[PDB]
Amino acid sequence: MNPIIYTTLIMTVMSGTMLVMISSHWLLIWIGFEMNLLAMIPVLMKNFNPRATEAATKYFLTQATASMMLMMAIIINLLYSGQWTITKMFNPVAMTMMTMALAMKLGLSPFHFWVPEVTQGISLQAGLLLLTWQKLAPLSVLCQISQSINPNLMLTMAMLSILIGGWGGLNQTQLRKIMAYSSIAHMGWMTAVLPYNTTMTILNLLIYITMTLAMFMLLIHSSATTTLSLSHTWNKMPVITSLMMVTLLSMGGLPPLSGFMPKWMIIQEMTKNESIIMPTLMAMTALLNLYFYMRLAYSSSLTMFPSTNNMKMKWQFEHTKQMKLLPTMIVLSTLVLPMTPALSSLN
Amino acid sequence: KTLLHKYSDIPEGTECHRKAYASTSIGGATGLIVSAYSIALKPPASFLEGVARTGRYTFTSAAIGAIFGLTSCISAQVREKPDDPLNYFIGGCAGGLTLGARTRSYGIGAAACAYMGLTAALVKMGQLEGWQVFAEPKV
Amino acid sequence: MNVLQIVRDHWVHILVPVGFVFGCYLDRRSDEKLTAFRNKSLLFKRELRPNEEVTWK
Amino acid sequence: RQWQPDVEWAEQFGGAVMYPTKETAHWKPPPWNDVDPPKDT
Amino acid sequence: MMSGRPGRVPLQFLPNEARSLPPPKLTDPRLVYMGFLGYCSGLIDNAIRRRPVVSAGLHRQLLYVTSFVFFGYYLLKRQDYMYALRDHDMFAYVKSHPEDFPEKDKKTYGEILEEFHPVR
Amino acid sequence: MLKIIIPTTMLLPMTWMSKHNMIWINATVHSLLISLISLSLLNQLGENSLNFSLTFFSDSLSAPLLVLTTWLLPLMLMASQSHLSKETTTRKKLYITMLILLQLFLIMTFTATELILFYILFEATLVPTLIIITRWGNQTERLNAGLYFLFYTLAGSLPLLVALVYIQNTTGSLNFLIIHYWSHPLSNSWSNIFMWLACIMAFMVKMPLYGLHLWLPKAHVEAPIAGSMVLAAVLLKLGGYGMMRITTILNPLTNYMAYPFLMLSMWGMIMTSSICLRQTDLKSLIAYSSVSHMALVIVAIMIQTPWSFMGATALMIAHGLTSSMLFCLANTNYERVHSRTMILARGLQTLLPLMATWWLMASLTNLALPPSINLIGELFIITASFSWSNITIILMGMNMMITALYSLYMLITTQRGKYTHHINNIKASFTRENALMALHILPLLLLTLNPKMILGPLY
Amino acid sequence: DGPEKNYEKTMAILQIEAEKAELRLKELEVRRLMRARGDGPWYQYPTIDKALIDHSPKTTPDN
Amino acid sequence: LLDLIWLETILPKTTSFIQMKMSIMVSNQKGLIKLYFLSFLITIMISMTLFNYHE
Amino acid sequence: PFFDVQKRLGLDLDRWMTIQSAEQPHKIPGRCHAFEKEWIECAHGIGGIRAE
Amino acid sequence: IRLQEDPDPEDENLYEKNPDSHGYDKDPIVDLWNMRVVFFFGFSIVLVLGS
């Protein structure tokens, strides 16, 4: 693509997301989702292989279906209230339609099937954008309409997301599919506390985006998309694999790392609401994510896999480009737990 | 919820036929849902193969429900203990044993006896003590 | 002899001692914000000696 | 010396999935460069 | 909770009523940890970029440190103001609703009968 | 506690900034200096605790544990520097960094005034421990050992996290002092029963309780020597210390909730002592013996008497020292014959006389020979159990008999008999190894002169 | 130092820890009441701003 | 019997086996748009029916 | 809005179409203008919880 | 060859080059000083003065 055209398409994706987050009118929110999808489709097809084309097609189908359901929910809400302002929904079935549409856009468990395939089918930069920036708009809408969501529907979808992200990621040797299933589990963690405290959702989203940015930038730095290709990285740049190991430990929520903060805060906020069984289930289920994170860490940094003879060529060469803000992303994703009370700034 | 309401409102250890019917209905409904998802995501090679898979899943789940209900209610009325989680534990283990019979495997049967019995005992405890699975927001 | 090498090589030997003194000083400051009951307990409180103004620090 | 993974250990993770069953026997690892060859013209 | 609070003007990191609280001290332990985070970021930047991690680019590590401390000071102010607001609203609500917060009648352990459980 | 914590933190910059060949010297010197400083925490008060700040405090329970940790670090360093001689400078510094991080986490864990802070610090110990085991262990089995240790601990710990935040929401505080002074009796209900289980199971799996112990043989066997030292000496004691702290909110529910655990540990001490009689791996035998002593500690904590708590404290200290000594003694033979099989190298007393003497001392302490503090702890727990129920004397006497049998059996098979004919590489004991055993054994015997220093706050 | 200092410092520690426990319970209660009743500064969810209503004379009189 | 076999079988081995089986059931998918959207129809219908959400 | 840029910058980006009692072209009235006006004037500034 | 791998090396005897080896370091001077600092700070200070 033309660098100017790619910059414009990226800016249009972000501007659709911003239109979603700054509008008080449902039509403009729908417009923002539309603009985001329109600009997003070409960045998925940037490399243009049949895998990229299929990933873009599946993404388009799911997002367009969700957008039509969202518009139908808006129209039912208007039919019963005459209201365009994004606020509590005045109709229950419109609320159900909207919740399902937003979950399908996010990729929650009953609508999760697109996330692994699309993430695998696109490049690591496209996947980084897909699993970080594309979560903002639906989650912001959900935080705005949280006072009218059905807690049972939302909590069901979140628990299923955690379970499926844990189980699906257990079987993966592809790094992009592992990232997608980790993303499903983390979206479940975000959406479980959404009925109770949207500040916890924002906190968890920020921590997850930091970890995902760090991990995807480490993968791009490594040029690895399979677990065996990553197993060669120690023999080229062991610093990258050790940083990746501490980041994976953070993703598993191991104290004293930054990834433990969202789980701990969400468990506390849930127990404040007489919710004890669900947090226990969620914390226990996250051990699956931690298991395949630990498998990746074993294959990458904690042990040394066989290398190749052609790796001696790569030793005499440096990186042409350097990932921006990667050291900051790594420090933020691992070391920020002592700063937890600053979460009140998100209030 | 009416499917669960009709099971819940009839007291424990009484009218064992009605409670068995309600648990059978819950089992059949759940098996129908799992059959729907299985048919959707792992389609058969023919309509009759799908009908057979649906009936197999549905009968397994309905038999688990009927067995759990019969054993739980009868052990409650026989011992005069309708608030004891032990009747629900016996029900869960009998459900695990009939699931093992349906899969015709002793290992699945034993593991399912343990797991489903403990689960049903926990459910009885949560009913008695007002535990919430989805707690409505308050604070 | 060779003072430059000795002070450029064994300078790390000051780190743990001075960390110990800094820990002692930080322990000192922690007590300064825990004096809401100095000379006020029902057990220990007493009148100050004529030039005395506090009972511990 | 310390045991380190060899080829037989590495190839547990080089498959299509992590737990090979019969329903994934036909699955192959995807292309190295993510591109599939063009079909019949 | 705090989204629809009255007077809460949009996109305002510190409101003007925050200037009534004491600003955080310069040697604040949290601010020093912010600076430490910046220093670790500089070290990791040297490591990833394949430079000597301790002695390469002292201006860059220094800038990491000062920018981290700069953001941390304002973050600390906003956090402290949010907690001050929380306490302010809690005390106002307890005051306006005395019936919800009764004055509990205090009793001594000499008149309170606590059950003794033997360990034996 | 900052006069202890900050010097330990300063070990990291000093380690990373020291010459490649001054690494072990510098770390050993300054960790011994920190251990000297930690001894001043043994000046305790009869009634109150040493409440330094809002976030750290010390009492007679945690001070001996802190001293044990700060003492273990230098011995670790002496044990490690042999098998890590061929490693790179950066990797040696990383190993030292892991050990320092573990010590710092343990120090803050034993002094944390708040329950959630204790939880985070006690969970933080997993990370350097897991790194040590899986990166610097010797066998392919270290990976599975790491997974077992990690997931056993976490399956225990997460329900504890839920219970702790629930307790904070209902009681208002997790502060240890507030928790003690505002103690409410725990009623008999399923809610409280499961709160008890959540509060107890993490420490149960950490000790470990018999039946939840299968991670320990793997982890203590596959780990490098320093890892085994810490895992046996200080990491097991986290469960006992935490159980002693948290049982103050579990009464009178502990009266009947402890019956399954009392039965499990009372019979599993017999079971694991019997397992030691047939272990063909020396390191595995030493690992399996930790389960029996920790079962005794479990019983002592579960019966909740002053004598039981005194015995449990003394037993934890004595077991830490003795188990680390035994692991080091096995490692010295492993570094010669490159195998953990016990009947591989026999008749070692006629080749390594002073090392055979060290072996005899270690076996005698594992025997709980009086007046060692091992015996003091075991006897106090036995007396408290006898008061709890007289029939406990059958099982505990059986256990001390079997313990004698397997300890002396290990001594006889490794040290006595005829040397192996084809093993011609048993070099003379280095000054470093003899000093390691001496620094294990001398403070153990000196504690007999002042036993109240390890008898806990109920003395 | 003398026993007095540890005694007094324990007293101050206990005082502020007890006040923090009390404040935490009170905050939880205030939160529950505010979320249930909507008469506090918290949980104020937006309603339409009434300055958006046009009160000008319309084309028809009955509106 | 106890340590190497049944204590292994009860907690860690059976749990690991269950997780592996669930992983196989969840992860192995045909990759077909058609089946995914049919399952979506099932989920949408269930949310508007017995799962009491729209009511 | 999640980020009320309009109320910070004083801009009316989409609030003009948000209700039918807002200003209309040629002052054409909404069919439920009085009803919406009364509900809005009741519910103004007391929060959604109270207004419900 | 099944892969290009180095053969397992033989363990080095600290006594072979240093009969006076204390077992701390292959270099005799740092080995001697490691022994000295270990013994002094452990026995002379922490054990005797600590006790």
In angstroms, what is the resolution? Answer: 2.1
Q: What are the distances in angstroms from CA B125 to CA B15, B96, F189, F333, G58?
A: 21, 19, 9, 55, 64
Six token digits for residue F336: 């010669």
| Distance between CA atoms of residues A28 and H20, nearest Å | 45
* Of the candidates F410, F414, F390, the residue with the CA atom closest to the CA atom of residue F402: F410
DSSP 8-state code for residue F417: S
- Closest Cα of chain C to G4: distance in Å? 6
CA angle F398, F401, F404 (to 5 degrees): 150
Residue E23 in domain: yes
Torsions phi, psi of B105, nearest 5?
-150, 125
Q: Are A183 and A212 in contact (CB under 8 A)?
A: yes
* Of the candidates F157, F172, F179, F299, the residue with the CA atom closest to the CA atom of residue F251: F179
* A327: nearest CB among E1, E44, E78: E44
* Of the candidates I33, F135, E83, the residue with the CA atom closest to the CA atom of residue A234: F135
- Return the beta strands (E) in F154-273 as ranges: none
Six token digits for residue C9: 């090589």
Q: Are H39 and B40 in contact (CB under 8 A)?
A: yes
Residues of chain I positioned with their CB less than 8 A from the CB of G38: 46-50
A339/E34 Cβ within 8 A:
yes
Give the DSSP H/E element, type plus range, for residue F51: strand F50-51
Q: How far is CA F221 from the centre of its chain?
A: 14
Residues of chain E positioned with their CB less than 8 A from the CB of A335: 37, 40
Residue E30 in domain: yes
Question: What is the DSSP annotation of A54-100?
Answer: HHHHHHHHHHHHHHHHHHHHHHHHHHHH---BSSS-S-HHHHHHHHH
- Closest Cα of chain B to A279: distance in Å? 10
Q: Are G7 and C31 in contact (CB under 8 A)?
A: no
Chains C and B touch (3+ CB pairs under 8 A): no
Domain range for E87? 1-97
Residue E10 in domain: yes
| Distance between CA atoms of residues C53 and A75, nearest Å | 76
* Of the candidates F358, F345, F361, the residue with the CA atom closest to the CA atom of residue F421: F345
* Of the candidates B123, B132, G25, the residue with the CA atom closest to the CA atom of residue A270: B132
G28/A85 Cβ within 8 A:
no
Q: Are F302 and F254 in contact (CB under 8 A)?
A: yes
| Distance between CA atoms of residues F133 and F153, nearest Å | 15
B5-12's contacts with Cβ under 8 Å and 24+ in sequence apart are B7/B69, B11/B82, B12/B72, B12/B73, B12/B76, B12/B82, B12/B83, B12/B87
Hey, is the C-beta of E32 within 8 angstroms of any chain A C-beta?
no
Residue to mutate among H16, H17, H23, with most A CBs inside 10 A, is H23
Q: Are F1 and F53 in contact (CB under 8 A)?
A: yes
Residue E103 in domain: no
Q: Are H28 and A171 in contact (CB under 8 A)?
A: yes
CA angle A163, A164, A165 (to 5 degrees): 95
Chains F and E touch (3+ CB pairs under 8 A): yes
* Of the candidates A126, A191, A271, the residue with the CA atom closest to the CA atom of residue F164: A271
Closest Cα in chain A to I51: A88
Number of folded domains that form chain E: 1
Hey, is the C-beta of E102 within 8 angstroms of any chain I C-beta?
no
Hey, is the C-beta of G24 within 8 angstroms of any chain E C-beta?
no
Q: What are the distances in angstroms from CA A325 to CA A64, A124, A221, E44?
A: 33, 17, 13, 11
| Distance between CA atoms of residues F261 and B101, nearest Å | 34
Chains C and I touch (3+ CB pairs under 8 A): no
DSSP 8-state code for residue I24: -
Residue E62 in domain: yes
Hey, is the C-beta of B47 within 8 angstroms of any chain A C-beta?
no
* Of the candidates F414, G37, F83, the residue with the CA atom closest to the CA atom of residue I51: G37
* A167: nearest CB among H27, H31, H44: H27
C12/F6 Cβ within 8 A:
no
| Distance between CA atoms of residues F111 and A177, nearest Å | 43
| Distance between CA atoms of residues A65 and A59, nearest Å | 10
Six token digits for residue A309: 């003879």
What is the Rg, in whole angstroms, of the alpha carbon atoms belonging to chain F? 21
F54/G10 Cβ within 8 A:
no
Six token digits for residue F94: 């990383």
Residue E52 in domain: yes
| Distance between CA atoms of residues F301 and F388, nearest Å | 12
| Distance between CA atoms of residues F235 and G9, nearest Å | 31
Residue E65 in domain: yes
Residue E110 in domain: no
Hey, is the C-beta of H53 within 8 angstroms of any chain A C-beta?
yes
Hey, is the C-beta of H28 within 8 angstroms of any chain D C-beta?
yes
Q: Are A217 and A232 in contact (CB under 8 A)?
A: no
Hey, is the C-beta of A280 within 8 angstroms of any chain F C-beta?
yes
Cis amide bond preceding E24, omega within 30: no
